[PDB]
């Protein structure tokens, strides 16, 4: 057998609250600076579908 | 004629911007950045390019 290099991100990264942005207020990327996770255009729909106007909010 | 030796802006501009371009970078080099943990625990970051 062979041991594969740490070719994994593994690095989770949580986000209670931390660094944001001057022009938007929304937290920016990071992982090592506790960057918030992106709610992209796709997931926007998902929620829309179910019918959960709040979870969206 | 007081228009035969009147400059044209296109060229006066190119001298005016020059200096100005400096007294803005240089002056921005003798400035600190005060962090304002905007009433939350967050952090008012001081950029202008979150390229996600």
From Swiss-Prot, chain A:
Domain of life: Eukaryota
Localization annotation: Nucleus, Nucleolus
Coiled-coil residue windows: none
Function: DNA-dependent RNA polymerases catalyze the transcription of DNA into RNA using the four ribonucleoside triphosphates as substrates. Component of RNA polymerase I (Pol I) which synthesizes ribosomal RNA precursors. Besides, RNA polymerase I has intrinsic RNA cleavage activity. RPA190 and RPA135 both contribute to the polymerase catalytic activity and together form the Pol I active center. In addition, subunit RPA12 contributes a catalytic zinc ribbon that is required for RNA cleavage by Pol I.
Any further remark recorded for this protein: Three distinct zinc-containing RNA polymerases are found in eukaryotic nuclei: polymerase I for the ribosomal RNA precursor, polymerase II for the mRNA precursor, and polymerase III for 5S and tRNA genes. Present with 14100 molecules/cell in log phase SD medium.
Subunit annotation: Component of the RNA polymerase I (Pol I) complex consisting of 14 subunits: RPA135, RPA190, RPC40, RPA14, RPB5, RPO26, RPA43, RPB8, RPA12, RPB10, RPC19, RPC10, RPA49 and RPA34. The complex is composed of a horseshoe-shaped core containing ten subunits (RPA135, RPA190, RPB5, RPO26, RPB8, RPB10, RPC10, RPA12, RPC19 and RPC40) where RPA135 and RPA190 form the DNA-binding cleft. Outside of the core, RPA14 and RPA43 form the stalk that mediates interactions with transcription initiation factors and newly synthesized RNA.
Family recorded in the similarity comment: Belongs to the RNA polymerase beta chain family.
Protein name per UniProt: DNA-directed RNA polymerase I subunit RPA135
Record lineage: Eukaryota, Fungi, Dikarya, Ascomycota, Saccharomycotina
Residues of the full protein shown: 1033 to 1089 of 1203
Swiss-Prot record, chain B:
Region called Disordered, residue ranges: 24-52
Compositionally biased residues, Basic and acidic residues: 24-40
Post-translational modification, as annotated: Contains an average of four phosphates per molecule.
Note: Present with 4070 molecules/cell in log phase SD medium.
Family label: Belongs to the eukaryotic RPA43 RNA polymerase subunit family.
Subunit structure: Component of the RNA polymerase I (Pol I) complex consisting of 14 subunits: RPA135, RPA190, RPC40, RPA14, RPB5, RPO26, RPA43, RPB8, RPA12, RPB10, RPC19, RPC10, RPA49 and RPA34. The complex is composed of a horseshoe-shaped core containing ten subunits (RPA135, RPA190, RPB5, RPO26, RPB8, RPB10, RPC10, RPA12, RPC19 and RPC40) where RPA135 and RPA190 form the DNA-binding cleft. Outside of the core, RPA14 and RPA43 form the stalk that mediates interactions with transcription initiation factors and newly synthesized RNA. Interacts with RPO26/ABC23 and with the initiation factor RRN3.
Function, in words: DNA-dependent RNA polymerases catalyze the transcription of DNA into RNA using the four ribonucleoside triphosphates as substrates. Component of RNA polymerase I (Pol I) which synthesizes ribosomal RNA precursors. Besides, RNA polymerase I has intrinsic RNA cleavage activity. Through its association with RRN3 is involved in recruitment of Pol I to rDNA promoters. In vitro, the A13-A43 subcomplex binds single-stranded RNA.
Record protein name field: DNA-directed RNA polymerase I subunit RPA43
